[PDB]
Design a protein around this ligand. Structure first.
Ligand SMILES: [Mg+2]
Ligand SMILES: [Mg+2]
Ligand SMILES: [Mg+2]
Ligand SMILES: [Mg+2]
Ligand SMILES: [Mg+2]
Ligand SMILES: [Mg+2]
Ligand SMILES: [Mg+2]
Ligand SMILES: [Mg+2]
Ligand SMILES: [Mg+2]
Ligand SMILES: [Mg+2]
Ligand SMILES: [Mg+2]
Ligand SMILES: [Mg+2]
Ligand SMILES: [Mg+2]
Ligand SMILES: [Mg+2]
Ligand SMILES: [Mg+2]
Ligand SMILES: [Mg+2]
Ligand SMILES: [Mg+2]
Ligand SMILES: [Mg+2]
Ligand SMILES: [Mg+2]
Ligand SMILES: [Mg+2]
Ligand SMILES: [Mg+2]
Ligand SMILES: [Mg+2]
Ligand SMILES: [Mg+2]
Ligand SMILES: [Mg+2]
Ligand SMILES: [Mg+2]
Ligand SMILES: [Mg+2]
Ligand SMILES: [Mg+2]
Lengths: 62, 380, 132
RNA sequence: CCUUCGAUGUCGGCUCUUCCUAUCAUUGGGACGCAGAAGUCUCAAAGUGUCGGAUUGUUCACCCGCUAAUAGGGAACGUGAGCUGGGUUUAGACCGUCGUGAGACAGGUUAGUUUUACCCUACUGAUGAAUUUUAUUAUAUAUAUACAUAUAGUAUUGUGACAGUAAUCCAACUUGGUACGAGAGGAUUAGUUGGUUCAGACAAUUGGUACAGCAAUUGGUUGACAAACCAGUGUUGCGAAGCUAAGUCUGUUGGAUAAUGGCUGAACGCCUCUUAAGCCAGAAACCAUGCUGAUUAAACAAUACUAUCU
RNA sequence: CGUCAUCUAAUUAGUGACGCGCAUGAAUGGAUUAACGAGAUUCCCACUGUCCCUACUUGCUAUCUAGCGAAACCACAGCCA
RNA sequence: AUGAACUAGCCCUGAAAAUGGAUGGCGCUAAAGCGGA
């Protein structure tokens, strides 16, 4: 089964789940849950949240 | 004078006495037309509703915008444990309608069949069906000879097995299943071989077939005209409140007519819906009952954490395209079409590419429980 | 050219003001009608991202104003479902000025354009830079 | 000027149902000054539809649009214990014309309390006994029998008289740049893929909802930390389950006919669809099939078990 | 619903002009006018459940129960063509 | 042995409205209809 990344908290998205969003320039983003899309449209950064994969990578925790 | 502008009527008058139904179980009003060139066969089955999920399928419609693409569809799961055949009943035609000759029962019946005849079994001596099954076979054969000679319609009495489901109820459900097919003698020889056995569901239906569904809708109680009938909501300035109908009728038929929508009870209605297609018939003896040729993860049909408000499905089942009236646990009656469909949709055969089994509590993210432990590593 | 256009959610009713998205000289469009709309008593006509509309220009160069013109919707901000299984939405609402036959009056679209629209109108797909 | 002056609420709109046909569109036909296309006159026919807006208190009117078409009407000029109160039509006030004057004006203008249902029926849903002057489309062992049979209680499965009923319309492409036509132009029909209005459900996905829950924080108060609390839900972010649309699914085929076109065939040695006898094809209309109810039939059948007693 | 222009997509509404004015006009005061007004009217930006098209939710009633307990109205009474 | 032109009895066309309805009802055609005895 083919999956794709989450672009905010890079999980795997199985078919029938997602939510895409096109910026003013033609860059496509792909979030799976409502929470992630809401956080991304409030201009928050994944590097500033303790539970995300980006934070654990910048703190040598993975 | 005439109304200023035209609009179609709100309600439908063909479902008119919107009252609560007599019973939970959905009853068949008419059976399919009997063709006597076919071999004898059963025409109906009964199961319980579990939940929904979605699948992935490849389209095969030349001319469509979706001719060669992968799509997603919703589906409904019905738990379909086998029934048991327990009796025979024969009808003959009269100018007053169909008429029963007699009923013949099998030699032994189960305690969950007998519970349906009691309002409280726990305090009783349980003497139902304890004398009549002790008759000599000669009387039964004479009765069957009479049924062969004078009757024109046979039906078979069958019942469900609620102990194999997660239901709290223990009484079985009883229904009559008509038997279409050849001559009356062949019908009788057909039924008797089944009189104390199991009907599995794949004996009755086939993959890719088209089916009709009978059940009772979900209940909601007393509702207003705005919700019950969908009438135009009234302006904010109105003095006694705005959720009503402004005019009940002209002066002078000096009564209210039966076509005017009022408040009343909504839901718990009896319905019959046509043309629901079968996608897969599962089997309880099969380890990969929700895996495809393109996805070889070994899976069952039940999502991570159980079907919400139902339980775990661990018998054999049906997968239907679309939706079905009723709540979780509601009994669903299944019937073949009145006459067989020959359109392109009813003949096309379906190949599935993905069945989803992620949790329906919250927003599920894994297909199995092993993936979840593999992703996080060791916890505290 | 075929006209199939599997259904798309309508949210752009009569009275909306959207961007102009091209180089014809106008800056916005004011929707006054939708082609092929039927009858229903109190209901407003509304459009989706592949429909032709009638509109006027409220700010822009003086030869385009005070007129009834044709337009075609290219981007919309309301989420709509794709048959593959996800939902989509843009930033803003945009359209271009066209002929009654769908021939552009300008010669270049500015930003991205939706794939459903570009399949029904070939000149627009020719004149677009990115098709999303 | 017949009824109402010990009172029948007096314009228009909004909402909602039903009826008519003098038919606008949709169905099937006849005629043309009918090549095709586009139209015009006319027959059966009321099954299904008949919209969004700018100005005006408006009925009416007029213009901008889409459409398949934007037909005409009735029900105490349908509808105020349904609403609204812009106009008209009490008492305040301004202008013009008229009057010696108090005042007048079907001439303008501005501000000016809209009361009561718990009764009877009707209608919508919700419980519920009683029914021998009563009933029977058979029961018995090919033969007999209405000079007959029938108790009650609890319970399951069924019959179905009668009443209600549901789907509707459009586009693109192929047939075909073909038939027809000097050219210019340019069908019908059938097929495929989609859509509008309507109806019956449903929640796997997307969105809305918050006095399950978790977290943040302003003022104040328990000596501090910790834990909390008050400010009628102090204020914010996310927010499962459930409900829910703007989201998803489903929406048949037979009988007998109307208009019309025909067959055989006298009256009337010829002819004639019958304006005699006897026949055929045939419509979105009718009757069924299918669907909902069936204390709408004070209606009934088979079955299981049981009643110091058939 | 005077004619012309303007405002809109569309204007019996608003504004600026024209004047043989049914019946305008000088302390019955005429024509203007900054500041002021719970005074009458038209357009523009911001804003929004007024609307497309409705849904979900809290308190207090209504509801069932134990106590307590009125009135208006009433020729006689309450199915239809 | 055909062709016409007139005349008057029954029948028919002319003959379209709004709740479902009215020779008083059922119904009636070797009349239970119309003109006589
Ligand atoms: Mg009020
Ligand atoms: Mg869920
Ligand atoms: Mg585990
Ligand atoms: Mg309206
Ligand atoms: Mg009086
Ligand atoms: Mg009165
Ligand atoms: Mg009155
Ligand atoms: Mg026409
Ligand atoms: Mg005419
Ligand atoms: Mg009136
Ligand atoms: Mg009148
Ligand atoms: Mg009133
Ligand atoms: Mg009124
Ligand atoms: Mg009234
Ligand atoms: Mg007033
Ligand atoms: Mg006054
Ligand atoms: Mg959500
Ligand atoms: Mg939710
Ligand atoms: Mg205005
Ligand atoms: Mg004077
Ligand atoms: Mg003077
Ligand atoms: Mg004066
Ligand atoms: Mg109380
Ligand atoms: Mg008294
Ligand atoms: Mg002659
Ligand atoms: Mg008489
Ligand atoms: Mg008589």
């Amino acid at each position: 089964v083919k999956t794709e990344a989450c672009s905010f908290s890079e999980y795997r998205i199985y078919p029938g789940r997602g939510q895409k969003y096109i910026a003013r320039d033609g860059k496509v983003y792909f979030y799976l849950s409502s929470k992630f899309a809401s956080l991304a449209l409030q201009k928050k950064k994944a590097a500033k949240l303790r539970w995300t994969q980006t934070w654990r990578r910048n703190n040598k925790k993975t | 004078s005439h109304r200023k502008f035209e609009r179609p009527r709100h309600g439908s008058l063909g479902f008119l006495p919107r009252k609560r139904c007599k019973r939970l179980r959905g009853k068949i009003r008419s059976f399919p037309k009997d063709d006597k060139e076919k071999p004898p066969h059963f025409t109906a089955f009964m199961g319980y509703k579990a939940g929904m999920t979605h699948i992935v399928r490849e389209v095969d419609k030349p001319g469509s915008k979706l001719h060669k693409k992968e799509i997603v569809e919703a589906c409904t799961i019905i738990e379909c444990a086998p029934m048991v055949v327990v009796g025979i009943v024969g009808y003959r035609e009269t100018p007053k309608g169909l008429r029963i000759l007699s009923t013949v029962w099998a030699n032994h019946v189960s305690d969950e069949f007998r519970r349906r005849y009691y309002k409280n079994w726990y305090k009783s001596e349980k003497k139902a069906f304890t004398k009549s099954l002790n008759v000599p076979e000669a009387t039964k054969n004479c009765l069957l000879k009479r049924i062969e000679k004078y009757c024109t319609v046979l039906r078979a009495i069958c019942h469900t097995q609620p102990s194999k489901t997660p239901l709290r109820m223990k009484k079985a459900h009883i229904m009559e299943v008509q038997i279409n097919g050849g001559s009356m003698k062949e019908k009788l020889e057909f039924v008797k071989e089944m009189l104390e056995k199991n009907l599995p569901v794949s004996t009755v239906f086939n993959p890719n077939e088209m089916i009709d569904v009978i059940s009772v809708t979900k209940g909601h109680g007393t509702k207003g005209v705005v919700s019950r009938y969908g009438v135009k909501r009234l302006p904010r300035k109105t003095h006694r409140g705005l959720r009503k109908v402004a005019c009940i009728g002209a002066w002078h038929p000096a009564r209210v007519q039966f076509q005017i929508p009022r408040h009343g009870q909504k839901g718990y209605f009896h319905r019959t819906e046509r043309n629901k297609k079968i996608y897969r018939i599962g089997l309880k003896t099969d380890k990969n009952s929700a895996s495809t040729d393109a996805d070889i993860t070994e899976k069952k049909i039940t999502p991570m954490g159980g079907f919400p408000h139902y339980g775990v499905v661990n018998e054999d089942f049906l997968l239907l395209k679309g939706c079905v009236a009723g709540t979780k646990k509601r009994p669903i009656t299944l019937r073949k079409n009145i006459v067989p469909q020959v359109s392109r949709d009813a003949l096309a055969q379906v190949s599935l590419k993905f069945i989803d089994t992620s949790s329906k509590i919250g927003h599920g993210r894994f297909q199995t429980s092993e993936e979840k432990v593999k992703y996080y590593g060791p916890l505290k | 050219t075929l006209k199939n256009k599997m259904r798309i959610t309508l949210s752009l009713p009569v009275g909306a003001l959207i961007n102009c998205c091209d180089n014809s000289g106008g800056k916005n469009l004011y929707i006054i009608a939708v082609q092929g709309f039927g009858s229903c008593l109190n209901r407003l006509p509304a459009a989706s991202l592949g429909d032709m509309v009638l509109a006027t220009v409220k700010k822009g160069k003086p030869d385009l104003r005070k007129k009834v013109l044709n337009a075609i919707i290219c981007r919309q901000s309301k989420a709509w479902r794709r048959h593959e299984g996800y939902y989509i939405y843009f930033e803003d609402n945009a359209g271009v000025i066209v002929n009654p036959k769908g021939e552009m009056k300008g010669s270049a679209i500015t930003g991205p354009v939706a794939r459903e629209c570009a399949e029904l109108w070939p000149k627009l797909s020719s004149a677009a830079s990115a098709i999303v």
